[PDB]
Design a protein around this nucleic acid. Structure first.
Ligand SMILES: [Mg+2]
Ligand SMILES: [Mg+2]
Ligand SMILES: [Mg+2]
Ligand SMILES: [Mg+2]
Ligand SMILES: [Mg+2]
Ligand SMILES: [Mg+2]
Ligand SMILES: [Mg+2]
Lengths: 67, 128, 36, 188
RNA sequence: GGGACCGCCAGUGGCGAAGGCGCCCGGCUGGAACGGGUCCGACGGUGAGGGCCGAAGGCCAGGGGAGCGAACCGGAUUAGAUACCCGGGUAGUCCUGGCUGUAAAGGAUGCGGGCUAGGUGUCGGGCGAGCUUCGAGCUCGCCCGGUGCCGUAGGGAAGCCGUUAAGCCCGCCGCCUGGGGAGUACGGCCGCAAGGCUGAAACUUAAAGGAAUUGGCGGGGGAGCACUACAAGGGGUGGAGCGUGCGGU
RNA sequence: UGGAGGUGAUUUAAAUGCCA
RNA sequence: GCGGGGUGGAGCAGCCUGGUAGCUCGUCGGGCUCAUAACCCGAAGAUCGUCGGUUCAAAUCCGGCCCCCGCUACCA
């Protein structure tokens, strides 16, 4: 409903057509409040961002050795 | 003492996923949930999400009848068929302790033959 | 049937396993129908 | 539904020669149903030293005197993950299986496993199996059912094979893999 | 309660004339390698005609039938689908007694003897040095016999073979003579049936086949691209009326 | 440097082509 | 015993539960393709055999009738 998370590192471009980006976020208020997970995002991303998500447990599938 | 414990049998293949919570002997069931009892598309009936939801609604109704911990037994079809667990195993185990239960020892009990019987197909496989 | 391996080569012809099967179905008729 | 509310929790007890201790709880309506349920607890849940966590025991009940399920030893087994890691290439496992009996008259079947240190011939592989039979049958003559089992799982027969067989070919990790009782004495 | 198969260790490892052979304990039985100042005294190589052994399948008689599954019955996919995919299933697959005698039965390489550089693994036997928790144990070197790889001289159209020859010699037997017609017709001898062994001519045709080389292509693999590609976006053409070019009449 | 084996997997439909 | 089918080039739906005449092979036009078959889209086509009743209002409820018929045999 409100869980924000703060990006710390980008991993690369997934996507059937180079659309989504895999990125390693860090939650900052709620159930984990400190854990590190991996998620796919749509759009552009720098480091230090603040995504808003809704589950805090999905852990997108690993990418092809980052290349 | 007053410490109830139990076992969770997690049966997973390429086509579905069943979670079964029983008492420590194994002979009295408490909660049994599947994947086609939550999702509707037969595509994602084996998916990780289906396991993640069923394995939550199992723990919910099994925690109310007193159970505090649970041991794990993960199983694949095995025998004269595939020996590798599907995609719901690591997802169900990971969303069973996140739901409030504890977790003791883990193990896999897939049945293996010492040179048993014959598979399907025949001498040429599934030439799909 | 005293076969020769030059004919399994499939280049400009049809399968030999299926030609033999058709020679047999004719030798069965030249024999029943007054191959006596 | 109420069907759950008519249940009743019983306390299971280990056998005598392992130390009568609590092992799990168990629900049922009437005790005439809790009469052949099989429990399984690792060795470490009874006087636990972290090292023998990979040995498992079986206890099967025979009596319900008012919220107490007294049991009787039934079998013993290692864990496939454990023995799954002692068998590598160039190491020549050796496998023995024997039917024996004891003083009380119990009949047992023991399945002990030796693991050489290299690749060896087979006429040098069956000498070891004969050694194992000869020190099992013997050891099963002066020891009763309760004392034989006490040391099979314990690890006091491994250190005897690992003595008389190391003088055939230097080995590693001889031990007992499974026990299953077959029959009872008609007496008692 | 019930029938079939014996996993990981398992190894261009072992045994057998080939087909082939994988749980453990006992009994009967065939062959080969090594060690041998043992014995007999050329007893040998090959083999037309004959003789036994021979995967899977099919057949004839009695049993058995768990899994799988030709024919066969249904669901789908497709323009059609007598097929590929799914749910079932009879003969078979297993045991005892016989017959058939065929495979890409392949090292596509018949069998015996002599000779012509090296290197390097690994299984069985023996010898000699070192260790040794004195174990039927571990390293290292040499001789003999099986089994793999790189490679001189030489051979070959080349691919590649190279003391396990496709090298240089001394033996014996089988088969080949452009592609089709054709392994067919006719005639014999086997088999209960299926079928096996032997096997031409009229006529037709200028090529059929082998090993390698540049390219092109793949509903093969990697690397890189491009708003006459996509993804993210802005404006539209395709429907109405007219301007102009084309087909047709 | 360079090769030889083994076990696994391999994804809806998708046919056809004057004349020089 | 007397009753049914009466409807695009067609084949039948489509009733009782009344207000699109309904889906498919066909017909001409356009897409896709280097081009043809298959595949997608658009229009044209009976207007319910016919008089009549019900019905605000009918293939749709039925009767009268015109056509095609239709399950059926010498009855000493
Ligand atoms: Mg040839
Ligand atoms: Mg002869
Ligand atoms: Mg089938
Ligand atoms: Mg063979
Ligand atoms: Mg396909
Ligand atoms: Mg073509
Ligand atoms: Mg077309």
């Amino acid at each position: 409903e409100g869980y924000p998370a703060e990006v710390i590192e980008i991993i690369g471009r997934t996507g059937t057509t180079g659309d989504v980006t895999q990125v390693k976020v860090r939650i900052l208020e709620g159930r984990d409040k400190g854990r590190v997970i991996r998620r796919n995002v749509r759009g552009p991303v720098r480091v230090g961002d603040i995504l808003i998500l809704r589950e805090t447990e999905r852990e997108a599938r690993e990418i092809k050795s980052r290349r | 003492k007053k410490e109830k414990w139990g076992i969770a049998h997690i049966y997973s293949s390429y086509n579905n996923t069943i979670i079964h919570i029983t008492d420590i002997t194994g002979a009295e069931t408490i909660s049994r949930w599947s994947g086609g009892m939550v999702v509707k598309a037969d595509r994602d009936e084996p998916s990780p999400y289906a396991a993640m939801l069923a394995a939550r609604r199992a723990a919910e109704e099994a925690l109310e009848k007193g159970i505090v911990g649970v041991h794990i037994r993960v199983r694949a079809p095995g025998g004269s068929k595939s020996k590798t667990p599907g995609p719901g195993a690591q997802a169900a185990i990971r969303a069973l302790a996140r739901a409030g239960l504890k977790i003791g020892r883990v193990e896999d009990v897939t049945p293996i033959p010492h040179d048993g019987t014959r598979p399907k197909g025949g001498r040429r496989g599934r030439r799909v | 049937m005293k076969r020769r391996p030059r004919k399994w080569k499939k280049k400009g012809r049809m399968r030999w396993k299926w030609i033999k099967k058709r020679i047999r179905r004719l030798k069965r008729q030249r024999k029943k129908e007054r191959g006596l | 539904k109420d069907k759950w509310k008519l249940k009743q929790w019983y306390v299971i007890y280990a056998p005598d020669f392992f130390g009568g201790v609590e092992v799990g709880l168990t629900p049922a309506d009437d005790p005439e149903k809790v009469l052949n349920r099989v429990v399984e607890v690792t060795l470490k849940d009874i006087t636990g030293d972290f090292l023998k966590g990979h040995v498992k025991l079986y206890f099967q009940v025979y009596d319900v005197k008012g919220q107490n399920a007294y049991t009787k030893f039934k079998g013993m087994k290692l864990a496939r993950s454990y023995i799954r890691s002692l068998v590598r290439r160039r190491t020549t496992r050796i496998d023995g299986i024997f039917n024996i009996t004891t003083k009380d008259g119990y009949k047992l079947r023991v399945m002990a496993m030796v693991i050489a240190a290299r690749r060896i011939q087979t006429s040098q592989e069956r000498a070891i199996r004969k050694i194992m039979q000869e020190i099992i049958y013997k050891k099963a003559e002066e020891l009763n059912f309760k004392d034989f089992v006490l040391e099979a799982v314990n690890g006091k027969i491994a250190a005897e094979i690992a003595k008389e067989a190391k003088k055939i070919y230097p080995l590693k990790k001889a031990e007992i893999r499974k026990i299953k009782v077959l029959g009872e004495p008609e007496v008692a």
